[PDB]
Symmetry: C4
Subunit: 259 residues, 4 copies
């Protein structure tokens, strides 16, 4: 099948004419558009342009549509070329995406009034329950700032996306606490003056020993509780120092991408 | 020796004909297979394909079999080319790999019964010992989840592989604790009200000061115990913050590779 | 428009003559300067030089001035080429930048005297206020070392530049402490022996639980205070372990760039 | 000056003959050695070899000796080429490097005897001083293992090399402790029940608050001591989390390079 020669600043490219006919609207696929760059003396089309980029521009046609930016070609440059060669806004975006008492009442009432008002205006434009209700509505209040603080949105999108990541930290943390709250429970017990009788309390210690917080409300006195204490102080920093790189790589990405 | 010219979208490659005969089954090595792409006018074989990839495709023959994917060529693309040129499933994989009271009894009995049953069904398809036995079988129980929790397998494979890494953390931790539990022992002693008489107890402090847990069950009161305490708080975070990058790079790899 | 051919060690480049006339002072743009490298037999200018670099050297003219160093070309090499081709000191720098009781009184008086003297010599060359004044002038004294200690300058430039980064850590820390000092306040209260009555004190705990310092002056005794305590020990290490990579990447850069 | 053409698997290179004469012993510089690869029909030397590598092989001569391995060319491959082209062992290495009661007495005496014996055999093949002598010889004893433990050597070489790095951590730690042990000293004092009278003791707290160890032997009770306590818990983790990446990058390098 009749072949074409494209010269990009001395670098010669060759393809069949049907390969370019696969995208009739692009500059190279449109006879009338590329006609301006034909050299009758050499029988080739010449372009005084960026050499590194054309590799992909041609592969686009041969691949049926794949438009990847060569790793060694800047983003601003390669974008200009896609524009010049007239690849089309569709493929253009596809590339883009593939590439990237009273005072308390007054304050409480004023907010409920403003919030509801603003909410409605924008939208339109028993004894035991009282204990659980105050901890809910009053505690999650801070979440309102997320609507005016860019940072929170980033923190949220990262959590929603890296949920599987966090799920491991907690999971691994469990197996850890369970294994340590048990290994010390068997060596800490059967000894007087030891504040490690039950297991439920051994859970707190472990959670306080793995995160390295160490309040001092519970500490091993026996030899068997210290051996598992050292392994715990280590296993903790080891287990915790895992999902971090992931969440950070996600946050830093969501942060840099949003900004 | 008679040479051949291969034109890949304008980029010309040249090699001897025996070099290609070294792999008679591949497309380029098989006369009958490459015959379809010969251009009589130019005396060369033409391929309307990916330019960046062919560099390696040719080196494969010249190297006697080495099939490396150019750093600047996507994985999905280069794979297609290996397929087209018909390099062979062997070399193909080789590339792949080179590239990547009653309730307690009931619960206890039910499990032992189910586990043993499931185990057998799947397979077929004195006073001091009682103290060490309860800490063993009962503590390692959690390890059963590893068979239904992907995460654990990753954590295990990383440990089994980065064993030499962890061995250092503990090793370095030793030398550290030994050096600190001794430097403070000589400056903390010979002083009343000091809870640092013996060395074995100095070990606990050091292990609790390097991991930065600091329960508060032991703290320097002398000037010589604080100087070594500062160096300890530092040396600890320095020694611990070493094998981490390795274990993480292993975990993150085993995690991303498994997923 | 009359075209030119430039041969760089066998690699042929082609451009129009006006493209090179866009920078009349450079070697390639100056007829008298490039005349020395013209080959009459082939009708092309030949240069026995670095191939990888010329890609950019030519793009410079086609782009109207863009001078980027190819990712695969060393800095010392590409710099030499820019010099040879005589691109010009301007574009040269632009590239550079786009690329990178008595003793107390005596001591106090002597300093004030020396400092003021040195300052002037270099420049030319009520009861409640006394409490706030001593904490100010006397505390910020150390900042004087910054003028003789390179390290501080780096620490400062990184802070001044990554201010938005730090602003998040503190911000996120707030929302965290507010949410935790409240979630535990509702579960820690309504229970005797609990040292978590007020909220202002719950703030201290949270700040001491998220940074993982854990002095032991405050710890959850209830079940509801421990559940939020575990989430706090985690959320803390998660929130803190975020701006770090940024500040470090800034510090390490400012450090390596300054040195 | 008479020019030469080198064809590397279809990729044509051109240089002057003197450029190659600059290294008379290499294959390309030796008439008798390159004669075997000359093609009389095309007037060029042909090599059925790796294309990516030759770029550097030629630059070596043009540069007067610079032998850099292209970023996109494997180490094992490029090495083979340097060998084939016969560049010379010198340049070869240069490239390599540019590229990479009684029991106590018995035990004490036996060691002193063995050590001194082994030392000599290998080499040949008052009251206050007693307090400082026991802390020295007895404490640094562990350092003997470094001769049989690879890990320590790595830890040492990294310290000796990244000394300037560590010097900052300690330095920055100083300025920090000095600024915090002073900011809290002015707000913690003038208040009863406060364990922060003197400054020397404020130093311990700061060092225990920045490393996040928090023994609990000292904690702010005033409002002014807590505000500076939060800034301290942060500034600490910020200052410490700086030299880490450096020491790690050095250790990981010294570790991977040694192994
Ligand atoms: K800690
Ligand atoms: K701690
Ligand atoms: K603590
Ligand atoms: K504590
Ligand atoms: K305590
Ligand atoms: K940490």
């Amino acid at each position: 099948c009749e072949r074409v020669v494209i010269n990009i600043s001395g670098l010669r490219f060759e393809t069949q004419l049907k390969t370019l006919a696969q995208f009739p609207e692009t500059l190279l696929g449109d006879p009338k558009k590329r006609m301006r760059y034909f050299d009758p003396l050499r029988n080739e089309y010449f372009f005084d342009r960026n050499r590194p980029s054309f590799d992909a521009i041609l592969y686009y046609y041969q691949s049926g549509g794949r438009l990847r930016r060569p790793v060694n070609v800047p983003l601003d440059i390669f974008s200009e070329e896609i524009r010049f060669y007239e690849l089309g806004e569709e493929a253009m975006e596809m590339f883009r995406e593939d590439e990237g008492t009273d005072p308390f009442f007054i304050v409480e009432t004023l907010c409920i009034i403003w919030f509801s008002f603003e909410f409605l205006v924008r939208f339109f434009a028993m004894s035991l329950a009282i204990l659980r209700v105050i901890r809910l509505v009053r505690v999650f209040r801070i979440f309102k700032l997320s609507r005016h603080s860019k940072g929170l949105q980033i923190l949220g999108q990262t959590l929603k996306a890296s949920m599987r990541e966090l799920g491991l930290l907690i999971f691994f943390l469990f197996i850890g606490v369970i294994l340590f709250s048990s290994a010390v429970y068997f060596a800490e017990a059967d000894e007087r003056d030891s504040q490690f009788p039950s297991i439920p309390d051994a859970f707190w210690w472990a959670v306080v020993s793995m995160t390295t917080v160490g309040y001092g409300d519970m500490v091993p006195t026996t030899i068997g509780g210290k051996i598992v204490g050292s392994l715990c102080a280590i296993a903790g920093v080891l287990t915790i120092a895992l999902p971090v790189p992931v969440i950070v790589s996600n946050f830093n990405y969501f942060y840099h991408r949003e900004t």
